[PDB]
Design a binder for this molecule. Structure first.
Ligand SMILES: [Cl-]
Ligand SMILES: [Cl-]
Ligand SMILES: [Cl-]
Ligand SMILES: [Cl-]
Ligand SMILES: [Cl-]
Ligand SMILES: [Cl-]
Ligand code: NA
Length: 129
């Protein structure tokens, strides 16, 4: 599913991302825009042989099992395919683990490079929330 901006903001709010670890909802919608273009089906293979999955491009090196990233972990205890569902529950739950790990939203390269330090409330402007 390719979400609209406000549709994603609502879904993310409902699943408890707004202000999760102190990151306002705009930061999560921004991250999703630049990680996946709001596409739950997005996949991108990394140089190390891991792959990033879903709306928040969660990586198989640490977070989900894809059956082809040897010696990786599965901290979210999910198949990576779960992160590609139209239902973002799995992705959000796993993002909460990630952002809690120590590095905050710097775990998302697109967030660091395109959202951090920017006016992220823009991403939730106009939305009914
Ligand atoms: Cl929308
Ligand atoms: Cl947009
Ligand atoms: Cl915000
Ligand atoms: Cl992989
Ligand atoms: Cl959803
Ligand atoms: Cl933080
Ligand atoms: Na893994």
């Amino acid at each position: 599913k390719v979400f609209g901006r406000c549709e994603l903001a609502a879904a993310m709010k409902r699943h408890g991302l707004d202000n999760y670890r102190g990151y306002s909802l705009g930061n999560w919608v921004c991250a999703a825009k630049f990680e996946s273009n709001f596409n739950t089906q997005a996949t991108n293979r990394n140089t190390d042989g891991s792959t990033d999955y879903g709306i928040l491009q969660i990586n198989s090196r640490w977070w989900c099992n894809d059956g082809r990233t040897p010696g990786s972990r599965n901290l979210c205890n999910i198949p990576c395919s779960a992160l590609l569902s139209s239902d973002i529950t799995a992705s959000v739950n796993c993002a909460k683990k990630i952002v809690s790990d120590g590095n905050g939203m710097n775990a998302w390269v697109a967030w660091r490079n395109r959202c951090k330090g920017t006016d992220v409330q823009a991403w939730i402007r106009g939305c009914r929330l």
